[PDB]
Amino acid sequence: GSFSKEESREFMAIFPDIVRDLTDAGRHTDIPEVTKRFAKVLQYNVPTGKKTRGLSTVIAYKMLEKPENLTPENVRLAGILGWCVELLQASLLIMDDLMDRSETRRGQPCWYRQENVGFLAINDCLHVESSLYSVLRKYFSHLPCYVPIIELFHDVNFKTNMGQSLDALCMKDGRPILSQFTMKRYSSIVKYKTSYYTFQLPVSLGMYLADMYDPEQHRQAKTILMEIGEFFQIQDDFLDAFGDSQVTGKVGTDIKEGKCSWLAVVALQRSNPAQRQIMEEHYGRPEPESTQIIKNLYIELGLPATFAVYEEESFNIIRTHIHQISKGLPHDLFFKIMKKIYKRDA
Amino acid sequence: GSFSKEESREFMAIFPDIVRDLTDAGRHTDIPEVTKRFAKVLQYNVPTGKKTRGLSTVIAYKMLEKPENLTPENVRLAGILGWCVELLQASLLIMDDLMDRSETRRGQPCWYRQENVGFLAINDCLHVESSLYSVLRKYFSHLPCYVPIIELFHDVNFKTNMGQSLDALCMKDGRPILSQFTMKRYSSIVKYKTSYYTFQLPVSLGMYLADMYDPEQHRQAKTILMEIGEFFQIQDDFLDAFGDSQVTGKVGTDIKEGKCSWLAVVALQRSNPAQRQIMEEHYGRPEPESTQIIKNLYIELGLPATFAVYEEESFNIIRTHIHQISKGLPHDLFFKIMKKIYKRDA
Ligand SMILES: CC(C)=CCC/C(C)=C/COP(=O)(O)OP(=O)(O)O
Ligand SMILES: CC(C)=CCC/C(C)=C/COP(=O)(O)OP(=O)(O)O
Ligand SMILES: O=P(O)(O)C(O)(Cn1ccnc1)P(=O)(O)O
Ligand SMILES: O=P(O)(O)C(O)(Cn1ccnc1)P(=O)(O)O
Ligand SMILES: [Mg+2]
Ligand SMILES: [Mg+2]
Ligand SMILES: [Mg+2]
Ligand SMILES: [Mg+2]
Ligand SMILES: [Mg+2]
Ligand SMILES: [Mg+2]
């Protein structure tokens, strides 16, 4: 547990085998041009993030499984399951960068902006997603958890798509629909676009690999992880406006794209009539000066301190909710996840 | 069998239930804005094609299953399985139209060109694909064929992505790689981008729903269906240059996008040095006059008559190969598929 350097190195050591499995490395193919290119798609887009979701899968398994069952082989299976989550993440971010007209991801150009990619990034998005099911078939097809694991990936993929769609409906006729930027809409967006795939998916996979199918245990885990998910996406929204791109690895676009971000929702709650006028005039505009005006309003409204205090109070509340978790569910699993993301700058 | 009007009407009657299943029609949702929009995504993009692949799934089942097992309920399951193939087709075409910068699909604007879609079509592509697995879980999760069916969809999706990628690598530095436009490259492209999902997938699904898992029966079916698939994509390539858009429902882009089409490959085989120079100068150019010059060369080289004769000879050869099919595999299934596509103008 505790997302150590050793934990990261054991997880990273699996990645080259995932690439070999999906590119027929060492095996005859009639289409080597595609398998060689797909190696570069995977190497660019999959392994250079924080790997929070992959590592969370392994830590969940290690803390849920009986100690006597934690063989090197079973721990490797959990790591492979973690990489399947990272393949879903990689696919989502390729598509998300196209939709958000983003510049940088993980400190390199967004994949769609690279030479001879463009709209081919759409196919690469689909290709990376489809590839996780090939890995699942190879290593898990013989196990009782196989169908539960596949059905969970299918369901989380569908839910994430619904979330990406609601996120995108922030604008119509080139202006943001500020009247609809409520905390209710915000909670709905982040539940579907982030919480299911980021927190619910890793822990539920850990439970399934340990042959834990109890509906009440899954429901209790889900309740806490959907709260953690909302908290995580609020942190992401703060990073978009106030993050250092040299640390976050990405340049923010939420203001220009007119997104229903936490900062936008809270700005509208805290705004006097004049400040509301500034949002209505300058939010979701292409002009750099319009973005700077909105950032200046965010600073004037004290959004940095408001976020800082919200993050501390939300951390305390989630810790209270974790204390209420029963069954055999280890509290320390949820505490470790929270400790890993709390007050993050990336 | 025989793709009758009655067959089409029975298949079409299932579609509204597929839409209701994927949009929580009659059920409470916290995100009605997305479920209502997704109804319009499905209604626009899924049901207005020829439905050859969906209908082929039903006809395969009806000709492989024991007559006493062809209850209305089992025939409905085959139709639902057919609609899962049509969801995969719908997803592929949304993405393919973005990548091919196409104007029209099924006699209406390409989905990405509609108001307030754009790059959101990428998400809609992913959403429509993920949705077929929800339908599979609802109606088939209790059946022996469930895992075989899921694994076949996963494998065919991955293969189709590899094919879309090879298709896209026709150009580098804005010029087509005419030296690589060989019949060998062509056969590889169409095997992956068309044959698996168009012909192999429907018949293999029909076999699985009839609990036919014999590896040799699947291999024999695959051999004929990969031949039919290549034949079908050659017909598609002819339609791109010489089709009537009022009949095909789509405007061709292969010449402008510099595609390794059958017409391009055969043009290069049949071209004298001067005619080769015309391809090298005018193939894969944005200027309308460049496209017209290539179409004029195609007419001069007699590509219409060359295609017409190829189609007749290929039909005869495939019919010979079908005669060689053994086991209990019904020859009439493969004959019906060929009769449905032979000399098509759409
Ligand atoms: C060279 C640099 C500065 C790289 C930045 C790496 C980084 C902090 C990525 C976040 O993980 P992710 O990409 O998986 O995203 P998420 O925040 O959604 O977990
Ligand atoms: C109003 C008009 C003219 C509509 C055209 C309909 C049509 C012939 C679609 C082909 O089916 P499809 O879209 O499923 O494609 P494919 O050729 O790949 O089967
Ligand atoms: O803000 P987004 O939702 O676009 C983002 O968090 C990615 N994402 C997409 C869905 N869930 C998360 P990112 O800031 O990484 O570009
Ligand atoms: O020619 P394409 O491969 O792009 C096509 O056939 C679609 N497609 C994509 C993959 N297989 C078939 P369409 O002419 O319908 O645009
Ligand atoms: Mg983004
Ligand atoms: Mg986004
Ligand atoms: Mg963000
Ligand atoms: Mg096309
Ligand atoms: Mg295409
Ligand atoms: Mg075509």
Q: How were these coordinates obtained?
A: X-ray
Residue B124 marked in a binding site: no
Residue B242 CB neighbours (<10 A)? 17
Expressed in angstroms, the distance from the first to the final Cα of chain A is: 20
Q: Which residues of A touch B161 (CB under 8 A)?
A: 123, 126-127, 130
* Residue A100, marked binder: yes
CA A240–ligand 3 middle distance (angstroms): 9
Cβ proximity of B51 and B346 under 8 Å: no
What is the CA angle A256-A262-A263, rounded to 5?
Answer: 60
Q: What does the alpha-carbon distance between residue B262 and residue B269 come to, in Å, rounded to a whole number?
A: 11
B234: its two tokens: 């050659």
Q: Is the CB of A236 under 6 A from ligand 3?
A: yes
Q: CB B305: neighbour CB atoms within 10 A?
A: 9
Instruction: Give how many domains chain B has, as a whole number.
Output: 1
CA distance A257 to A171: 8
Closest residue of chain B to A157, computed from CA coordinates = B130
Pairing of strands B171-172, A108-109: unpaired
Give the Cα-Cα-Cα angle B173, B122, B163 (nearest 5 degrees): 55
What whole-number distance in Å separates Cα of residue B237 and Cα of residue B48?
21
| Residue A308 CB–ligand 1 contact under 6 Å | no
For chain B, give the secondary structure using H, E and C.
CCCCHHHHHHHHCCHHHHHHHHCCCCCCCCCHHHHHHHHHHHHHHCCCCCCHHHHHHHHHHHHHCCHHHCCHHHHHHHHHHHHHHHHHHHHHHHHHHHHCCCCEECCEECHHHCCCCCCHHHHHHHHHHHHHHHHHHHHHCCCCCHHHHHHHHHHHHHHHHHHHHHHHCCEECCEECHHHCCHHHHHHHHHHHHHHHHHHHHHHHHHHHCCCCCHHHHHHHHHHHHHHHHHHHHHHHHHHHHCCHHHHCCCCCCCCCCCCCHHHHHHHHHCCHHHHHHHHHHCCCCCHHHHHHHHHHHHHCCHHHHHHHHHHHHHHHHHHHHHCCCCCCCHHHHHHHHHHHCCCCC
**How far are the Cα atoms of A41, A334, B184, B189, B282 from residue B279, in angstroms, in the given order?**
31, 63, 19, 21, 5
CA distance A96 to chain B (A): 9
Measured in Å, residue B5 CA sits from the centre of ligand 10 at 26
Structural domain boundaries enclosing B99: 1-346
Amino acid in position A236: D
Q: How far is B133 from chain A (nearest CA, A)?
A: 6
Cα-Cα-Cα-Cα dihedral sign, residues A30, A34, A36, A38: negative
Q: Which amino acid is at B175?
A: R
How many of the other CB atoms lie within 10 Å of CB of B194?
Answer: 21
Q: What are phi and psi of B171, to 5 degrees?
A: -125, 145
Closest ligand, as measured to the CA of B168? 9
Structural Rg of chain B based on CA atoms:
21
Contact A127 B165 (CB under 8 A): yes
Report yes or no: A50 and A346 within 8 Å, Cβ to Cβ: yes
Residue of B34, B138, B181 to mutate, testing the A interface (most A Cβ within 10 Å of its Cβ): B34
Resolution of the structure, angstroms: 1.9
Q: How many Cβ atoms are within 10 Å of B34's Cβ, its own excluded?
A: 26
B164 → chain A, closest CA residue:
A123
Does the CB atom of residue A96 touch ligand 3 within 6 A?
yes
B259/B284 Cα distance (integer angstroms): 7
- What is the C-alpha separation between A151 and B82, in angstroms, rounded? 20
Q: Give the β-pairing of B108-109 and B171-172.
A: unpaired
3-state secondary structure chain A: CCCCHHHHHHHHCCHHHHHHHHCCCCCCCCCHHHHHHHHHHHHHHCCCCCCHHHHHHHHHHHHHCCHHHCCHHHHHHHHHHHHHHHHHHHHHHHHHHHHCCCCEECCEECHHHCCCCCCHHHHHHHHHHHHHHHHHHHHHCCCCCHHHHHHHHHHHHHHHHHHHHHHHCCEECCEECHHHCCHHHHHHHHHHHHHHHHHHHHHHHHHHHCCCCCHHHHHHHHHHHHHHHHHHHHHHHHHHHHCCHHHHCCCCCCCCCCCCCHHHHHHHHHCCHHHHHHHHHHCCCCCHHHHHHHHHHHHHCCHHHHHHHHHHHHHHHHHHHHHCCCCCCCHHHHHHHHHHHCCCCC
Q: Does the distance separating the beta carbons of A147 and B123 come in below 8 Å?
A: no
Q: How many CB atoms lie within 10 A of CB A66?
A: 8
Residues B42/B128, Cβ–Cβ less than 8 Å: yes
The response to whether A244 counts as a known ligand-binding position is: no
CB B51 within 8 A of CB B165: no
Phi, psi of B104 (to 5 degrees): -130, 150
Q: Regarding beta strands B175-176 and B171-172, do their DSSP bridges make them parallel or antiparallel, or are they unpaired?
A: antiparallel
Give the count of Cβ contacts less than 8 A between chain A and B.
134
Tell me the chain B residues in contact with residue A149 when contact means C-beta distances shorter than 8 Å: none
The verdict on the CB of residue A104 being under 6 Å from ligand 1 is: no
Distance CA(B117)–CA(A169), nearest Å, equals 10
Test B131 with A34 for CB contact under 8 angstroms. Answer: no
Query: Going by C-beta distance under 8 Å and a sequence separation of 6 or more, which residues neighbour residue A109?
Result: A103
Burial class (CB within 10 angstroms; exposed 0-12, middle 13-18, buried 19+) of B336: middle
Q: How far is the CA of B234 from the centre of ligand 10 (A)?
A: 9
Say if CB A293 and CB A278 are below 8 A apart. Answer: yes
Q: Which of A95, A155, A162 sits opposite B31 (nearest CB)?
A: A162
Test A119 with B99 for CB contact under 8 angstroms: yes
Nearest-angstrom CA–CA distance, A314 and A302: 18
- Beta strands B104-105 and B108-109 are antiparallel
The widest CA-to-CA distance across chain A, in whole angstroms, is: 68
Check A158 against B99: CB less than 8 A apart: no
User: In degrees rounded to 5, what are phi and psi of residue A176?
Assistant: -75, 145
